[PDB]
Structures are given as structure tokens and as C-alpha cells.
Amino acid sequence: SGFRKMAFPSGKVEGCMVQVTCGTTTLNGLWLDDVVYCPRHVICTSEDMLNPNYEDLLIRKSNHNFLVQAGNVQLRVIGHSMQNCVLKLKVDTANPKTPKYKFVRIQPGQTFSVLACYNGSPSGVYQCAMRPNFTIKGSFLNGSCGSVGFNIDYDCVSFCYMHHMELPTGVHAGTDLEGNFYGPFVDRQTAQAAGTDTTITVNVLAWLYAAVINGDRWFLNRFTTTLNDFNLVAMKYNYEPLTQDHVDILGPLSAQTGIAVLDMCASLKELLQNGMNGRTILGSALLEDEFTPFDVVRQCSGVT
Amino acid sequence: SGFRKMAFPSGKVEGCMVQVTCGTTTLNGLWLDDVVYCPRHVICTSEDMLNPNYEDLLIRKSNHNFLVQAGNVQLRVIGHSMQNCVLKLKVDTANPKTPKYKFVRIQPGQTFSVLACYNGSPSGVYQCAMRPNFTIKGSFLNGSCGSVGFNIDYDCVSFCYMHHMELPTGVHAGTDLEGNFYGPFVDRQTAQAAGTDTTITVNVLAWLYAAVINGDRWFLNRFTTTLNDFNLVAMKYNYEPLTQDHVDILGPLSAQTGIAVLDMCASLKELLQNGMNGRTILGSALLEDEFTPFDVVRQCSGVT
Ligand SMILES: Cc1cc(CN(C)C(=O)NC2CC2)no1
Ligand SMILES: Cc1cc(CN(C)C(=O)NC2CC2)no1
Numbered sequence: 001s002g003f004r005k006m007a008f009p010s011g012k013v014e015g016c017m018v019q020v021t022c023g024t025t026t027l028n029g030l031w032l033d034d035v036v037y038c039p040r041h042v043i044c045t046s047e048d049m050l051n052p053n054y055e056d057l058l059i060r061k062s063n064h065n066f067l068v069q070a071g072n073v074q075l076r077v078i079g080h081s082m083q084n085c086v087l088k089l090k091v092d093t094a095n096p097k098t099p100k101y102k103f104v105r106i107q108p109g110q111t112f113s114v115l116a117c118y119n120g121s122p123s124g125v126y127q128c129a130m131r132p133n134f135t136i137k138g139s140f141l142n143g144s145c146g147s148v149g150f151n152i153d154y155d156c157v158s159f160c161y162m163h164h165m166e167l168p169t170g171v172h173a174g175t176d177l178e179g180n181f182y183g184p185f186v187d188r189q190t191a192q193a194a195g196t197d198t199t200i201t202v203n204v205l206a207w208l209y210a211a212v213i214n215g216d217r218w219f220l221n222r223f224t225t226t227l228n229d230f231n232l233v234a235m236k237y238n239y240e241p242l243t244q245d246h247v248d249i250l251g252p253l254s255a256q257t258g259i260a261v262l263d264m265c266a267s268l269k270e271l272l273q274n275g276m277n278g279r280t281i282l283g284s285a286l287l288e289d290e291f292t293p294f295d296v297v298r299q300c301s302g303v304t
Numbered sequence: 305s306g307f308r309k310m311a312f313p314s315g316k317v318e319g320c321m322v323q324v325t326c327g328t329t330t331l332n333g334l335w336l337d338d339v340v341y342c343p344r345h346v347i348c349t350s351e352d353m354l355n356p357n358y359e360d361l362l363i364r365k366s367n368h369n370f371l372v373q374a375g376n377v378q379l380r381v382i383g384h385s386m387q388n389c390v391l392k393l394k395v396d397t398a399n400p401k402t403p404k405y406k407f408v409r410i411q412p413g414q415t416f417s418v419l420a421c422y423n424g425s426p427s428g429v430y431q432c433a434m435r436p437n438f439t440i441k442g443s444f445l446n447g448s449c450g451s452v453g454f455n456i457d458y459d460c461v462s463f464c465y466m467h468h469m470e471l472p473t474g475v476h477a478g479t480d481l482e483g484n485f486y487g488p489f490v491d492r493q494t495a496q497a498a499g500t501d502t503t504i505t506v507n508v509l510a511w512l513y514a515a516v517i518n519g520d521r522w523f524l525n526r527f528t529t530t531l532n533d534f535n536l537v538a539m540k541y542n543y544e545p546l547t548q549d550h551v552d553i554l555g556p557l558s559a560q561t562g563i564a565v566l567d568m569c570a571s572l573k574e575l576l577q578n579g580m581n582g583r584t585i586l587g588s589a590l591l592e593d594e595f596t597p598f599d600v601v602r603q604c605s606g607v608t
Contacts, residue, residue: 001474004443006428009419011315115313121608124310125429137587139308141606170305170519215474275582276589283441285580285589302445304425 003210003282005290006299007113008152010125015097018075019120020089020146021067028117028146029068029089030162030177032098036068036075036089037177038146039164040082041187049189058082063089069120070095084179085164085187100156103177108132109200109240111292112149112160119143128161129203129290131171132240133195134183138163138172148177154304167192199239200289202246205264206296207288209253211281213300218279220259223266230265237272249293256300307514307586309594310603311417312456314429319401322379323424324393324450325371332421332450333372333393334466334481336402340372340379340393341481342450343468344386345491353493362386367393373424374399388483389468389491404460407481412436413504413544415596416453416464423447432465433507433594435475436544437499438487442467442476452481458608471496503543504593506550509568510600511592513557515585517604522583524563527570534569541576553597560604 020029020038024045029038041049043057061080066089068075079090106112111129115122116139128136128149140147140163149161164174164187171194173185185192212220225233231241247261254261268287276285291299324333324342328349333342345353347361365384370393372379383394410416415433419426420443432440432453444451444467453465468478468491475498477489489496516524529537535545551565558565572591580589595603 001445001470002441002443002476004418004428004430004432004441005309006420006430006443007311009314009318009426009429011313011318011426014313014315114308116310116606118606118608122313122315123606123608124308124603125313126308126310128308137306137308139306139310139603141305141604143606166305172306278579280590286584299428299443300445302420302422302427302447304422304427 001214003214003299005127007125007127008150010113010115010122012099012152012157013115013148013150014122015099016095017115017117017120017122019067019069021069022061022065026119027143028120030146030148030159031070031075031091031095032101034091034094036091037162038087038089039162039175039187040085040087040179041145041164042066042087046189052188054082085175085181086162086177086179102156102158104151104158104160105176105178105180106130106160108134109203109292110160111203111290111295112151114138114147114149114161114163116140116144117147127290129200130161130182132198132200134185135167135171135173135194135197136161140166140172167194169194196238199237199287201234201239201242202249202293203289203291204239204268204287205242205246205250205261206253206293207282207291208264208268209250209257209259210291210296210300212257212259214282216281219267219271219281221267221270223270224260224263225266225269226262227265230262230269233269233272239272252297253293305518307518307603309431311429311431312454314417314419314426316403316456316461317419317452317454318426319403320399321419321421321424321426323371323373325373326365326369330423331447332424334450334452334463335374335379335395335399336405338395338398340395341466342391342393343466343479343491344389344391344483345449345468346370346391350493356492358386389479389485390466390481390483406460406462408455408462408464409480409482409484410434410464412438413507413596414464415507415594415599416455418442418451418453418465418467420444420448421451431594433504434486436502436504438489439471439475439477439498439501440465444470444476471498473498500542503541503591505538505543505546506553506597507593507595508543508572508591509546509550509554509565510557510597511586511595512568512572513554513561513563514595514600514604516561516563518586520585523571523575523585525571525574527574528564528567529570529573530566531569534566534573537573537576543576556601557597
């Protein structure tokens with residue numbers, strides 16, 4: 001029993017983190033096979049970041065200008081290319097700790113673990129969601145650039161995020177491992193404002209199911225609703241619309257608890273309209289939206 | 305910027321987890337050098353757990369009755385002993401992934417990371433505190449027994465907790481790595497009720513400092529207080545008494561922010577008396593107490 005904001009064990013990713021330095025800029029790289037992936041930011045001065053022309057800045061850079069250090073051993077760079085907003089540095093040594101891996105582009109509302117790194121060295125691990133406005137709410141200081149987000153399916157690491165930057169509002173933006181930003185963000189130090197950070201409704205519902213499974217039941221009410229009625233209330237409270245696809249995804253939690261998804265929606269509707277009245281659910285005074293239905297099943301079933 | 309509930313990178317501990325089976329009971333062991341540490345519970349049936357005599361149960365057990373598997377390779381048990389509530393199984397192979405390590409007994413209010421494991425396999429990592437009633441609020445299913453809690457200082461893992469059991473209230477109790485329970489708990493399936501789960505005041509203050517550093521400042525007020533005045537309010541709200549030792553520990557955060565500790569106490573006093581009025585601090589609607597002053601400095605400074 002008990003329900004925690006749980007990250008994947010980070011060991012497989014720790015084995016992939018390196019330091020990348022270009023001139024005076026140091027950040028983190030991801031070493032998979034004989035390729036180090038890092039933000040193309042590695043080539044900018046902070047001056048450059050106001051209006052960088054990355055193709056033009058990159059002409060001035062040779063293989064030997066990219067210093068890649070794995071622990072306290074230097075890797076030899078034998079090639080480099082820009083793919084979207086990442087650099088791929090070809091090194092002469094395959095990472096011997098390369099796990100089975102994939103590159104995946106996640107959807108908003110999907111959760112993942114972040115291994116926060118500085119100078120190629122892991123500092124901590126925490127669990128994030130891709131927000132509906134394609135930001136994440138991370139913990140990243142200067143030097144954390146190139147830290148990665150990931151899911152693990154048994155022995156396969158799915159890399160979904162690389163950290164590039166902090167918006168003036170102190171929320172975070174980054175890319176998939178093909179170098180494509182999530183959302184409309186660019187790797188330039190300019191006016192970039194996030195859209196509405198809506199609540200990930202299907203995740204809140206999943207977490208309410210987790211609460212019931214773990215004995216927190218006070219919020220269960222005598223009502224039901226419909227998707228259309230619930231969605232009118234969702235819209236008013238800046239919750240994402242709930243679709244039949246979300247209802248289908250919550251089916252196994254519905255089955256395990258015997259609470260119909262639309263009944264849990266009606267409980268959630270009352271919590272939105274009435275508030276918590278100073279009560280807590282799984283030690284929270286707000287409705288948690290950074291657990292997916294898959295996360296709740298995993299943590300409630302003990303998957304390794 | 306941003307502030308997350310962050311665990312230590314788990315790789316160094318992942319390398320130490322094994323499966324221990326005795327008869328029909330499987331749980332997790334910690335493999336350091338040529339010793340596997342596991343809950344003495346490994347020898348009980350669930351029937352046994354109602355009133356176990358561990359010395360008597362252990363007479364019936366030989367080295368060959370303890371099955372230790374590291375990945376899919378069996379370790380040879382060449383000796384076994386009971387130390388308090390843990391078994392030490394001597395194996396014929398030193399763990400080649402043994403990190404630098406210490407065994408430490410933490411105080412209430414100290415935080416640590418838990419690597420939740422099942423069948424010797426890591427499932428997740430999350431951050432815990434030793435509660436003032438010597439419980440922890442974990443996420444542990446059947447089979448999670450022997451999962452460990454730890455801190456890391458650069459390259460040295462300090463092991464502070466091993467998971468033994470769940471109280472009927474769904475909170476958790478365990479031992480240090482010498483096999484001594486935190487608090488008054490015993491490894492028997494009996495009436496064990498936790499005392500008052502008070503709030504770790506010095507940790508709340510640390511987290512309010514983290515909030516100020518990260519731009520959440522709305523709760524800063526025009527008041528100050530004294531330790532004695534604050535403590536009258538703390539007692540009323542089931543907060544731990546704040547000592548001058550806690551004030552001293554918060555000194556560096558005081559210095560960094562320029563908010564006197566007693567001023568932050570007065571802000572906290574107003575939050576206790578007035579509530580949050582539906583506002584959040586670092587994305588929380590309650591006062592978080594599972595960050596130590598050391599945690600806040602570490603996460604705010606980017607220590608690896
Ligand atoms: C603060 C903060 C920084 C970041 C990522 N970033 C832009 C950097 O690390 N820049 C340094 C490496 C040249 N995210 O939040
Ligand atoms: C639920 C729950 C279980 C636990 C730890 N424990 C008692 C076990 O794993 N018992 C199984 C191994 C024989 N903590 O919470």
C-alpha cells in the first residue's frame with residue numbers, strides 16, 4: 001500500500017551521461033552506441049543565444065572543438081552533424097553500457113523520468129509530465145542542458161526528452177532525441193510564453209483510482225455523469241476534455257475497483273465544484289495529474 | 305529554476321539488489337562485498353508472522369535453504385547469521401558492483417531515497433522522510449521486503465533503511481542495516497499503531513526558502529516571531545518544536561535569501577493560522593516537509 005511519485009530506476013541512463021564542452025559552454029550529452037547526442041546550444045555563447053544562426057555558428061566548429069568526457073576519460077570525436085535542435089557527435093568508441101533503447105516522441109499528458117545532470121554527472125531523478133502546453137515543470141539549473149527524460153519497459157529505455165531551456169516563467173522546454181522541440185518553442189533567448197497549463201483529466205482520474213485502491217475513499221460520491229456533462233465542468237476548470245479513448249484506457253482501473261469511469265468523473269466533478277474542504281487524497285491537497293493510467297497500474301501491480 | 309521531489313540516482317544501489325528465497329518466501333536482499341543483507345522475515349510463513357520465534361525458526365535453516373539470485377545467476381551461501389532483525393548471508397563472491405558505502409542510522413526528519421524492488425529487480429525510485437513517529441510513507445507491495453533507503457555523498461552510498469513491513473494503517477516500518485527497527489516496531493503481524501505523525505518544521509522552513517529562491521514569494525509577510533512564540537503555534541498544529549540547532553542549520557538559506565529564519569517562522573505561523581486560501585507553493589496546496597535544509601541547498605546548487 002501507499003502511492004508515491006515514482007521515477008524509473010536511473011542506472012541504465014546514468015551509464016549514458018557524458019560531459020560535452022564547446023569553447024566555454026559545458027553541458028550534458030547522451031552516449032548511445034558511438035553517438036553522443038546534445039543540444040545544439042553547446043555551440044552558443046550566452047550572447048549568441050539572443051539570435052543564433054546555428055548553421056553559421058557550426059561552420060566555425062570542427063570535431064576537435066567538441067570535448068566529450070565520459071567519467072574522467074576523453075572520447076575522440078570523428079564526426080558531427082546537426083539534426084533539428086540536437087548535435088550528433090560520432091565518437092570512435094561504442095558506449096559499452098548502452099542499454100536497449102528507442103527514441104519516442106510522447107504526447108501531452110505522458111509522464112517520464114528525468115535524470116538531472118551537471119558536467120555529465122547525475123544529480124537526481126524525478127518524475128515529470130509533458131504538460132498540455134508542451135512545457136514540463138522540471139528542476140534544472142545552468143549546466144543541466146542535455147539532461148534526458150525516459151521511460152523503461154523492462155530492459156528497454158525509451159528516450160523521450162532532452163532538456164534545452166527555461167522560459168522566463170521558469171517552466172522548461174526541450175526536444176525529442178531527433179531534436180524536435182515539444183510545442184512551439186525555439187532554442188533562442190527570446191519572448192516565449194507558454195499557453196494554458198490545463199489539468200490532464202485522464203491522469204487525475206487514474207490517481208483517484210490509485211487513491212481508492214490505497215484506501216483513500218472519502219471523495220467517492222453517490223453521483224454519475226456523462227462525458228458531455230463532465231466536459232462542460234472540465235472546460236470551466238481548465239481540465240483537458242475527456243474522450244472515449246481516455247474512458248477505454250481507464251477500463252482496467254474501473255474493473256479492479258468496480259467504480260465505473262463516469263462515476264469517478266462525477267466524484268471529480270464534485271471535487272472541482274466543492275474543493276477538498278481542507279482534506280487530502282494520497283497526501284495531496286490538490287488533484288495530482290502526473291500519473292498516467294499506465295503508471296497507476298504499474299505502481300499498484302509492482303512491475304520491474 | 306523549479307523545485308522537484310528528487311531522489312538520488314539509483315544506479316549504485318540497483319547494482320546491489322538480489323532475490324532471496326527461503327522455502328516459499330521470496331523478497332529482496334542487499335549484496336555488499338560478500339554479504340547479502342535481508343529481513344529475517346525471509347524465514348517465516350505468513351502463519352509464522354503472527355508470533356514468530358526467529359531463533360527457533362532459524363535452527364531449521366541451513367546455508368543451502370537460502371536461495372540468493374543476482375540477475376539470473378545463483379550465489380553460493382557459505383554462512384548465515386542473524387543480527388537484530390536482519391540476516392547476513394555470507395556468499396562466496398564479492399559483489400563486483402559494490403559501491404563505496406556506509407551504514408547510517410538516521411534521525412526523524414531526515415530524508416532518503418527508496419529503490420522499490422520485487423524479486424531482486426528494481427521497479428522505481430522515490431524520496432521519503434523518516435517521520436517523527438519513525439514510520440515512513442512508502443509505496444510497497446508484497447515482495448518489496450528488503451528494498452533499501454539510502455543517501456549518496458558524491459560516490460559513497462549511505463544505507464539508512466531496509467523495508468520490513470506495513471502497519472494496518474498502510475504506513476511502513478523498517479530497520480537500519482544493523483537490523484534495528486526505527487521506532488518501537490517489531491517484525492510480527494500484531495497490533496502496532498503509529499504515534500502522532502507531526503510535521504517536520506525545519507523541513508517546511510527549508511522548503512519555504514526553496515520557494516522564495518524559485519520565485520514563489522506570495523506568503524512572505526511583514527511579521528517576525530521568536531522561537532518560543534512560534535513553538536506555541538507549532539505545538540497547536542502538531543508541528544515539531546523548532547530548536548536553535550534547526551535555526552543554525554537554516555543559516556545558509558537565510559543568508560542566500562536575506563530572510564531571517566524567525567521572519568520565515570512568522571510567515572509559516574500565518575500560513576498555519578490562515579491556510580493557503582486556495583493558493584499553491586511550488587505546486588503544492590499543503591506545506592511540504594520531506595525536504596531537509598541540506599536537500600534544498602543540494603537541489604538549488606546542482607550537487608552531483
Ligand atoms: C536555469 C536553467 C538552465 C537550463 C538549461 N540551460 C539553458 C543551460 O543549462 N545553459 C548552460 C549550459 C549553458 N534550464 O534551466
Ligand atoms: C503490502 C506490503 C508488504 C510489505 C513488505 N512485506 C511484509 C512483504 O513484502 N512480504 C512478502 C515477502 C513476504 N510492505 O507493504
